[PDB]
UniProtKB/Swiss-Prot annotation:
E.C. number: 3.6.1.45
Gene name linked to the record: NUDT22
Protein name as catalogued: Uridine diphosphate glucose pyrophosphatase NUDT22
Family membership noted in the UniProt record: Belongs to the Nudix hydrolase family.
Cofactor: Mg(2+)
Function: Hydrolyzes UDP-glucose to glucose 1-phosphate and UMP and UDP-galactose to galactose 1-phosphate and UMP. Preferred substrate is UDP-glucose.
Residue positions of motif Nudix box: 163-184
Length: 291
């Protein structure tokens, strides 16, 4: 799967909010482009003169994520974050020249990402009471990954001392994206666990935090809530469900070629961190069938 690489696999079946520290610092920002940020401004002007209803928004930038020694006490993960924007994304990661920017960042900074916006996404492996995961179909008309399968998620917007507020906004935002797109009540959702971080190589290496969330509704009840919003209550064009039993071998199915890279990231991390049991009971052949 060349279009997704794992930056982080969390221990303990995934990390809760209270085990994660953030460092939000301008040291973690994108570096100015070699020929100046005027190249970003030019791409943005061209875009607004065609679609003048577009607006900019701030975004979190992922610099790096350091895990503690396994089995340790205290905070288990440090997220190093800076700030970026939708405008900086369109002029860097989404640019036709994005590979040239990666090569120049290797040359100048020893860092393929130094000249990239790299906005942090969030996605969820969302499980129902009857043991299915939730999938959404993307419109065939949008710019990014048209007609492909996604999971719930989005790109959160700003507003360890300022750190703990940032970690809270990341966890909050994955629940808000589920309520906004799937139309589920907030009280049917568990607190999220962070499973890991995946990178989208088709989008010059921009990263998404992938989370596990449990819902107290069945697949039939989740479907009713999604549909009862009507066509204007969601950006996706349809909802569907795959048994957690069958998610184990999804990379061997025809579905795999229709999944966008960030959804492939969510499913690989679900399989390694929530699946793949370590104990004698769940690891027994009748419960973990070979092959
Ligand atoms: C929904 N509608 C209006 C907004 C358009 O998108 C944006 O201009 C945009 C939306 C969110 C964040 C952002 F930075 C930019 C898409 C069509």
């Amino acid at each position: 799967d060349p279009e997704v690489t794992l930056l982080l696999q969390c221990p303990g079946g995934g990390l809760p909010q209270e085990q994660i520290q953030a460092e939000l610092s301008p040291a973690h920002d994108r570096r100015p482009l070699p020929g100046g940020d005027e190249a970003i401004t030019a791409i943005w002007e061209t875009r607004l003169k065609a679609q003048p209803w577009l607006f900019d928004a701030p975004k979190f930038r992922l610099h790096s994520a350091t895990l503690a020694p396994i089995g340790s006490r205290g905070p288990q993960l440090l997220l190093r974050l800076g700030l970026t924007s939708y405008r900086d994304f369109l002029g860097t990661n989404w640019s036709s020249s994005a590979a040239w920017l990666r090569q120049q960042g290797a040359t100048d900074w020893g860092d393929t990402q130094a000249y990239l916006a790299d906005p942090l996404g969030v996605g969820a492996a969302l499980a129902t009471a009857d043991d299915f995961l939730v999938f959404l179909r993307r419109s065939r008309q949008v710019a990014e990954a048209p007609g492909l399968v996604d999971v719930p998620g989005g790109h959160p917007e700003p507003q360890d001392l300022a750190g703990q507020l940032v970690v809270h906004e990341l966890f909050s935002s994955v629940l808000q994206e589920i309520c906004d797109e799937v139309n589920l009540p907030l009280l049917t959702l568990s607190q999220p666990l962070l499973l890991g971080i995946a990178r989208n190589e088709t989008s010059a290496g921009r990263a998404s935090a992938e989370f596990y969330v449990q819902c107290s509704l069945t697949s039939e009840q989740v479907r009713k809530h999604y549909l009862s919003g009507g066509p204007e209550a969601h950006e996706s064009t349809g909802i569907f469900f795959v048994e957690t039993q069958n998610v184990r071998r999804l990379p061997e199915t025809e579905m795999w070629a229709e999944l966008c890279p960030s959804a492939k990231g969510a499913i690989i991390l679900y399989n390694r961190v929530q699946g793949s049991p370590t104990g004698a009971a769940l690891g027994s052949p009748a419960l973990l069938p070979p092959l």
